[PDB]
Amino acid sequence: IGTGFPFDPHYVEVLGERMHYVDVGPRDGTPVLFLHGNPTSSYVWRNIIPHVAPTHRCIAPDLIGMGKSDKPDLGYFFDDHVRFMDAFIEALGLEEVVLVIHDWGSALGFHWAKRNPERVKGIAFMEFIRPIPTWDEWPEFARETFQAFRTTDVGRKLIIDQNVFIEGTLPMGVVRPLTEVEMDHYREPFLNPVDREPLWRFPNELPIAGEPANIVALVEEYMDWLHQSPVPKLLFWGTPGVLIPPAEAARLAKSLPNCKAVDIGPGLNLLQEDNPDLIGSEIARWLSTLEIS
């Protein structure tokens, strides 16, 4: 499992800010958009992208306030991420796309897809945002932690003061140890405690037990759309998972139209850190099947 990030930086001005992106692969076809979540960057994709780069254009942006994207004094609400990602897409001039999405990236991806259905030729997803209608349905071992995260007081002491999301939650969304080189990559954007607002806001935006209602409403909408959509779907899942337990992958595999679903073996949240070659290989393959009518 490679620790290197051998991608030349690309930058584009988005709403008076600068966002970073990985851009590789053929220039000609349908492009593949990789959207990371919390608390990652395009780094999370580094070992998935080389599987796809040979046949497809690979576009992997750092979300505003993350990776090497600019860090303006925002609240980094979901709605800000939407604003910025909507704009990024239009800046690159993208028309049809395929979406490869994860964690908060999935909420972006689904949300954009709901709004632009005639431009999504496929979606691959994994460990994605769905409504967790009670805290019962959140992983036992992570309840106390995400409960404290969802406080201004101590949540911020943890995430912003202490950097627990990065030093603690992150390694704990991966089954294998992360090396020190890998940790340092995940740490780089958030060395300055100032810049960790995204990391605290995101958990406070998770649609758990009805709140925040704005997020719940919105996630409910994209999931309802997803159930009424033919668009080809590819669902990676792990055991036991975090945001998606095995049992729920099972249910969605069945419930979502035209959806293929691939078990990746041991996995928590950052599936891409536990089995890159498998997800990479399966995406690439599946991509080819989208051209078979």
Name the site residues for Cl ion (rule: CB under 5 A): 38, 202-203
We find the least distance from the C-beta atom of residue 258 to Cl ion, in angstroms, to be 29
Furthest C-alpha separation in the chain: 55
Amino acid at position 33, single letter: L
> Where do we find the tokens 């390694």?
171
We find the least distance from the C-beta atom of residue 37 to Cl ion, in angstroms, to be 7
We find the least distance from the C-beta atom of residue 259 to Cl ion, in angstroms, to be 24
For residue 48, the SS3 value is coil
Give the Å distances, CA to CA, from 58 to 21, 72, 128, 265. Answer: 10, 26, 20, 25
* Residue 10: both structure tokens together: 């690309």
Instruction: Select 43 or 202, whichever has its Cβ closest to Cl ion.
Output: 202
We find the least distance from the C-beta atom of residue 204 to Cl ion, in angstroms, to be 8
Instruction: Select 23 or 195, whichever has its Cβ closest to Cl ion.
Output: 195
We find the least distance from the C-beta atom of residue 206 to Cl ion, in angstroms, to be 6
We find the least distance from the C-beta atom of residue 203 to Cl ion, in angstroms, to be 4
For residue 65, the SS3 value is coil
Instruction: Select 148 or 253, whichever has its Cβ closest to Cl ion.
Output: 148
Instruction: Give the whole-angstrom CA distance, residue 1 versus residue 137.
Output: 31
Instruction: Select 14 or 170, whichever has its Cβ closest to Cl ion.
Output: 170
> Which of 45, 77, 78 has its CA nearest to residue 61?
45
Instruction: Give the whole-angstrom CA distance, residue 36 versus residue 43.
Output: 9
Instruction: Select 122 or 203, whichever has its Cβ closest to Cl ion.
Output: 203
By beta carbon distance, the residue nearest Cl ion is: 202
What is the signed CA dihedral for 5, 158, 213, 81, rounded to 10 degrees? -30
Instruction: Select 38 or 229, whichever has its Cβ closest to Cl ion.
Output: 38
